[PDB]
């Protein structure tokens, strides 16, 4: 590219892989959202929590793609793997799966940051620090807060706690 | 009628029967609403849910009657059977009876649509698709969502769950 | 009932019978309204006059039911008899049937008031005097005014008078 | 056409024929409107009723033509036959001719709907149900209401009734 | 009195006794309100419910006194007995005591109405029907609704139900 400067093939490829990870996460959240909209699940606040995350992950992918083009790299898309489950269990099961998913995205961001640092690519490092690393830390903290509250609500009567958390937190 | 065109005696009669079904459903909901207003039942959100449905069903009957006259058919009214119960039990019992009632109305709409299609009456088919079929599907989905939430709230202590659902959902 | 005080079984039963009378009157007015909406009758102001009365009678039934529950009585619903006619003739015939209907409702209110007085139930007597007795007298006077005007318009050419009354009074 | 999909030559031709019918109806209404504007006829409300219908029919033709192009069919225009009369008689004669005209348009819509159904063309069927079938039913009902009122006004003194209907309904 | 007309000594005395009953009820509610404000009771919505009733009962006494003077009777005040308890137990115990209190006031109103009727004092009868009888019926119905909800919340864990009712109803 006429514009490409200080942008390694290693980072370009890692950015494409990260786009796939974010789009896969968006797909997972789409599935989680619609599962909580089933008439036999019926937890509206949980559906809305995950549908909003599906949008956030798609937006992250789009920001990565815009950056790929700003740097002169070339977007390459791969198949998007279906989500790991068809049914997602309780809100507790879903929130545990979500935190696993976000930790995996955060680890991929940290890996890319390390690659950027190894490649002496400070534009990349700034980009991740600005738009991604803090968002992930904030989201993971929120999910951990939710997991703690969901868990405190189980002990006695799980259906009651599940309803209350959806009504009063989400 | 000077205006009647492509409107079978079969559809005319079925529309009169459907008006009776909607008015009967309105009556059932009136009874459900006032039962939840009893001082020894006292669930205001449940009363309001059913009173609003009584109004919706009456409005459906009125829309059918307006259509009967637009097509040149003749409204014929029959006695309105009293509702199937005098006392309606818990919110769970009432919501189960309501879903049974709406499924019966939906089946009567589907039957009328099939008759319209057999009679090559596309105005009828459009009328039902526009003002009735989607409303029924949406309402049945809402009731199923409510039934799932009511059921999740029972397990432990039924009075507590009944209060919470009325306070926090309805 | 934990709340019931000075409320006789006789009044409770009479209130249920009165609810049936008001709902039947509402049904009669629904039928009158839709008859005047027929393309071969086509008197819009007459349809609107009766449709508004159908709503007023339903509201009266609902006020009686609310009162039944306020006093600790128990609503009991019976079948609703179909209206006395399928076709209602001229505006004059319909207005005569309406005044007969309202006089019958007024007589049932007066009977209930007499029962309340015999049962020393001043809350009932106030309730009827406040929300029902004056409304009936006002409505009967209006219908008598209409009957006089309709009758003055017949003599010559009945179709002309029927049109003029609908256009210029209703 | 590069865009044409599931659009039969039979429907394309029937749509062109229907455009001709709507434009002919518009022409008929133009003639009716100007007849009622003659100084020796002089019924302004009747002129305005028909002039508004001339505009509605032209708009229907234009909507059909837009649809023809959306589907990749080709508009073909034919001569427009002059209206069936040069003078239109009384308002009663004109309203009878109008209802005959609208019933013929409605029958052509129903025929086209049947053809669409035979051709498995649901876009066509939706298009007619949405923009045409209900409009025709509503208009025919209005004309039948008018015919009933005009007829009730004749009996006695026809000029008087004709004036009153124009003044007080139209 | 120069103004006194048709106002019996029996009614005058009964009105003074009724003022004492209303002021005593106001005192009882003052005590109930402050008990629920104790740091070891601490149910704010219950305190506010009873403090508002203390004000309503005082206002009722003041309306009776204004009426006594309008009729030319003479207000006579007696000692006000302290409330029947110093501590009021749970919200359920308090609401049961409140309904007992209101039923006693309602019975005193009904007795006074009967005396008015025996004395042929229609001004008195109107006064009670207008400002007192309906208010009592409405209040008793509300308290019965509350008692039903409190009772449904006990079964399982009484502290939890007591908190929830205060938070979500009052």
Q: Which residue in this structure is represented by tokens 């309204």?
A: C33
Facing residue for C167 by CB, picked from D141, D151, D168 = D168
Residues near C95 by beta carbon (within 8 Å), at least 6 away in sequence = C143, C146, C147, C150
Q: Is E10 annotated as a binding residue?
A: no
Q: Cα angle at E80 between E75 and E86, to 5 degrees? A: 160
- B residues 69-128 near D, CB within 8 Å? 69-72, 120, 122-123, 125-127
| Rounded distance between C-alpha atoms, residue E31 and residue B75, angstroms | 63
Sort out which chain A residues have CB atoms less than 8 A from B160's CB and list them: 160
Rg (alpha carbons) of chain B, rounded to whole number: 18
| Rounded distance between C-alpha atoms, residue D15 and residue E69, angstroms | 87
- The DSSP bridge partners found for residue C80 are B80
Taking a C-beta distance cutoff of 8 angstroms, is the pair E101, E54 a contact?
A: no
Q: Cα angle at E81 between E76 and E82, to 5 degrees? A: 145
**Largest separation between any pair of C-alpha atoms in chain E:** 65
CA distances from C96 to A16, C93, C157 (A): 83, 5, 19
DSSP classification of residue C81: P
Domains of chain B, by residue range, sit at: 1-170
Resolution in angstroms for this experimental structure?
1.5
CA distances from E8 to C106, E19, E66, E75 (A): 35, 17, 17, 14
Tokens of B165: 């659902």
Half-sphere exposure of B155 toward its Cβ, with a 13 Å CA cutoff? 12
Class level of CATH domain E1-170 = mainly alpha
- The DSSP bridge partners found for residue B80 are C80
Q: Are the beta carbons of C5 and E113 separated by less than 8 Å?
A: no
Q: Which residue in this structure is represented by tokens 């006259």?
A: B69
Ordered DSSP codes for B97-166: HHHHHHHHHHHHHHHHHHHHHHTT-HHHHHHHIIIIIHHHHHHHHHHHHHHHHHHHHHSS-HHHHHHHHH
Task: Work out the number of other CB atoms within 10 angstroms of the CB of residue D150.
Answer: 25
Question: Helices A158-168 and A44-71 sit at what angle, rounded to 10 degrees?
Answer: 60
Taking a C-beta distance cutoff of 8 angstroms, is the pair C49, B58 a contact?
A: no
| Rounded distance between C-alpha atoms, residue A6 and residue A3, angstroms | 10
All chains having 3 or more CB pairs closer than 8 angstroms to chain A: B
| Rounded distance between C-alpha atoms, residue D56 and residue D66, angstroms | 15
| Rounded distance between C-alpha atoms, residue A72 and residue D84, angstroms | 73
CA distances from B165 to B46, B47, B120, E6 (A): 9, 13, 46, 56
Ordered DSSP codes for E23-56: HHHHHHHHHHHHHHTSTTT--HHHHHHHHHHHHH
| Rounded distance between C-alpha atoms, residue E15 and residue E131, angstroms | 14
Taking a C-beta distance cutoff of 8 angstroms, is the pair C54, C30 a contact?
A: yes
Q: C79-94 burial, b if ≥16 CB within 10 A, otherwise e?
A: ebebbeeeebebbbeb
Task: Work out the number of other CB atoms within 10 angstroms of the CB of residue A164.
Answer: 16
DSSP classification of residue B39: T
Taking a C-beta distance cutoff of 8 angstroms, is the pair B80, C51 a contact?
A: no
Question: Helices C44-71 and E134-154 sit at what angle, rounded to 10 degrees?
Answer: 70
| Rounded distance between C-alpha atoms, residue A98 and residue D35, angstroms | 75
Our CA-based measurement puts residue C68 at a distance from the nearest CA of chain E, in whole angstroms, of: 11
Tokens of D123: 């876009």
Cβ pairs B/D, distance under 8 A:
44
Tell me if residue B8 falls in helix, strand or coil: coil
Taking a C-beta distance cutoff of 8 angstroms, is the pair E94, E32 a contact?
A: yes
Tell me if residue C12 falls in helix, strand or coil: helix
| Rounded distance between C-alpha atoms, residue D130 and residue D137, angstroms | 12
Tell me if residue A7 falls in helix, strand or coil: coil
Q: Are the beta carbons of D99 and B123 separated by less than 8 Å?
A: no
| Rounded distance between C-alpha atoms, residue D46 and residue D149, angstroms | 14
Method of determination is X-ray
Tokens of A109: 């961001």
């Amino acid at each position: 590219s006429q514009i490409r400067q200080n942008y390694s093939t290693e980072v370009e490829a890692a950015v494409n892989r990260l786009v796939n990870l974010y789009l896969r996460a968006s797909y997972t959240y789409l599935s989680l959202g619609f599962y909580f909209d089933r008439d036999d699940v019926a937890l509206e606040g949980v559906c809305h929590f995950f549908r909003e995350l599906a949008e956030e992950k798609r937006e992250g992918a789009e920001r990565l793609l815009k950056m790929q083009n700003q740097r002169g790299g070339r977007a390459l898309f791969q198949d998007l793997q279906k989500p790991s489950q068809d049914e997602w269990g309780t809100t507790l099961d879903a929130m545990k799966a979500a935190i696993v998913l976000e930790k995996s995205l955060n680890q991929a961001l940290l890996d890319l940051h390390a690659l950027g640092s190894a490649q002496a690519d400070p534009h990349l490092c700034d980009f991740l620090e600005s738009h991604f690393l803090d968002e992930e830390v904030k989201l993971i903290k929120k999910m951990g807060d939710h997991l703690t509250n969901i868990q405190r609500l189980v002990g006695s009567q799980a259906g009651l706690g599940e309803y209350l958390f959806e009504r009063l937190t989400l």
